[PDB]
């Protein structure tokens, strides 16, 4: 990457970044089949299988609760549009049409009555064990069975389900991310594939599943007999490898600081601005930005990087009366504003101070620095381009 400092304005510009723009949401509806547990009873007394059966029955009882708690949250940013999706799939019609679509195959595309298409996935392993292997030997209504191997298989097969309940119970129906028990690695792989974009975008998302899980989330539909229904909204990064640049600034004092700080990515030649820090997130030299939280700015805005006194675009630099000393760290360096008259020093991690800095603005690189210190507070240099 190239990072160049602007003596005027006391800002920086790190160019050479490559976009990964979240342009849409893919919807993956899951059916976690449990296998009609509550029809099985434990009359043998205390037993290991009886502990595991109560755990599963207590789990969906609590899951039926958490759905009930957040349906009552209806009074009347991408999640608020995502529960609207969850509204249409919660009906008994869609659930049945979804379960019917998955009777034959473990995964298929189901066309919703609302004119949309979601991916339907079936995780049957729990119900398959509860019906074929479990309910056969416990059919006596006595759980103190001889095969201890069955109780340990019960613990292994129901773990994914128990964790999903814990996941939805703690976050009250909507997780902040796609976890390993919401979707496995393989289930994630099939979903991103099914997305409507080309091979390059599929390749990058498959190489960066951790960003897919990060920006994706999940909503709980509810229990329908022995079927935990929940939807997972996966991000669709439909535009990649476009130019991006970050311009972070310190107050230059005589006193002004640059208000159009933050991330900028081009999409189809139209430059777009990401003011908030959580809109964009970086992995190496790639910038994952939220398209929805984006502001289309005119391309004349790159004039703030040659001379701000250019009346082709109002660069909207802001002014303050009381000068404030600050340090805004950039990815490939640091800009230190030291206008109040304090001791300001560049340092290293095993040599100590390298040079004392003057009163004002001065840009530093990691090539000849590792820290920057004012007073007793020290700022460790790093590539925190994810900082605003």
């Amino acid at each position: 990457l190239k990072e160049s400092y602007l003596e005027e304005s006391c800002s920086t510009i790190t160019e050479g970044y490559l976009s990964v723009l979240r342009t849409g949401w893919y919807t993956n509806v899951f059916t976690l089949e449990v296998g009609d547990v509550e029809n099985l009873t434990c009359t043998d007394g205390p037993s290991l299988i009886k502990t595991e059966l109560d755990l599963t029955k207590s789990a969906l009882r609590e899951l039926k609760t958490v759905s009930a708690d957040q349906l009552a949250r209806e009074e009347q940013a991408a999640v608020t549009a995502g529960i609207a999706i969850a509204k249409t799939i919660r009906l008994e019609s869609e659930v049945n049409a979804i379960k019917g679509a998955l009777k034959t195959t473990n995964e298929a595309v189901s066309t919703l009555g609302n004119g949309v298409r979601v991916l339907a996935t079936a995780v049957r392993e729990l119900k398959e064990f509860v019906s074929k292997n479990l309910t056969s030997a416990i059919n006596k209504n006595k759980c103190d069975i001889a095969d201890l191997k069955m109780a340990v298989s019960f613990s292994q097969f129901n773990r994914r389900f128990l964790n999903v309940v814990r996941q939805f119970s703690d976050n009250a129906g909507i997780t902040p991310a796609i976890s390993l028990d919401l979707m496995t690695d393989a289930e994630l792989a099939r979903a991103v594939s099914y997305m409507p974009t080309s091979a390059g975008q599929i390749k990058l998302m498959l190489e960066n599943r951790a960003m897919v899980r990060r920006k994706g989330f999940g909503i709980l539909i509810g229990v329908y007999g022995s079927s935990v229904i929940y939807m997972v909204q996966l991000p669709i990064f439909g535009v990649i490898d476009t130019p991006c640049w970050i311009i972070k600034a310190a107050p230059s004092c005589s006193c002004l600081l640059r208000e159009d700080q933050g991330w900028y990515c081009k999409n189809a030649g139209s430059t777009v601005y990401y003011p908030n820090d959580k809109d964009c997130e970086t992995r190496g030299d790639h910038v994952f930005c939220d398209t929805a939280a984006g502001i289309n700015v005119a391309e004349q805005s790159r004039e703030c990087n040659i001379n701000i006194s250019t009346t082709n675009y109002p660069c909207k630099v802001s002014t303050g009366r009381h000068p404030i000393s600050m340090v805004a760290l950039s990815p490939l360096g640091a800009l230190v504003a030291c206008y109040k008259g304090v001791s300001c020093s560049i340092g290293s991690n095993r040599v100590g101070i390298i040079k004392q800095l003057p009163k004002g603005c001065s840009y530093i690189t990691n090539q000849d620095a590792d820290t920057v210190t004012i007073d007793n507070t020290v700022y460790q240099l790093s590539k925190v381009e994810g900082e605003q």
Epitope: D170, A177, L180, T184, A210, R213, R214
Partner: antibody, heavy 119, light 108 residues
Framework: VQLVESGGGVVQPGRSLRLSCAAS????????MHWVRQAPGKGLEWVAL????????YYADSVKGRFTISRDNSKNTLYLQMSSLRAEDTAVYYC?????????????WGQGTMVTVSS | DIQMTQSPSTLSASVGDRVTITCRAS??????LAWYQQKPGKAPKLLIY???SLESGVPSRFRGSGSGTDFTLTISSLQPDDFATYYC?????????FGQGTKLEIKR
Amino acid sequence: VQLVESGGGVVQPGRSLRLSCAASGFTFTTYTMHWVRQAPGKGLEWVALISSDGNNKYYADSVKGRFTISRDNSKNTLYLQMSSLRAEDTAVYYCARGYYSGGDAFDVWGQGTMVTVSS
Amino acid sequence: DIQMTQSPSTLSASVGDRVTITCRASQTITIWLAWYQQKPGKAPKLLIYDAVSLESGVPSRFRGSGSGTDFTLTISSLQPDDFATYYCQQYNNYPYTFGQGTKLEIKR
């Protein structure tokens, strides 16, 4: 289903040492591998990771520039080439397995081998 | 780096008690966290990955809870095995940082 570390011993400051980690019981070629070290008494400190294929290797700032992580999926072995060893690098070194693609929780660890860098 | 702050550093409790160790990250780490049980001279044993999900083999007395920056780990009924040192770990991004550790001592 186990990892076994080897190559630890006593060395002088500035010397070199190669740790190897033998993997067995799982599809080693699929998993992203790590080295995590723990000085005597102190807590845990991640040092390095290497991806399933090897294109992406990353190190902590402490060992950055001296240590080099590598792998050979043919022999199911994880490597760490330690150079410019200082006394701070005295620690037990475990190799650990990443849980899932992007989730680097360490679900399988090795016995650990003791490295002693003292003059 | 993301600084992981555990509390308390030392927790002294008896068999049968419930016990809550808290982890705190300097930045938001979503739900990417792990809790390890380390006994003297042995490798750490993973207990719960992500925020609340339990690893295979871990008893149900272990409970996770957390989102963003503030996470907890609660052992609902102390068994003599549970007394060790517990660590939290973020894996939001590298470098992967651990907590100071929490020593679960028995009270007398």
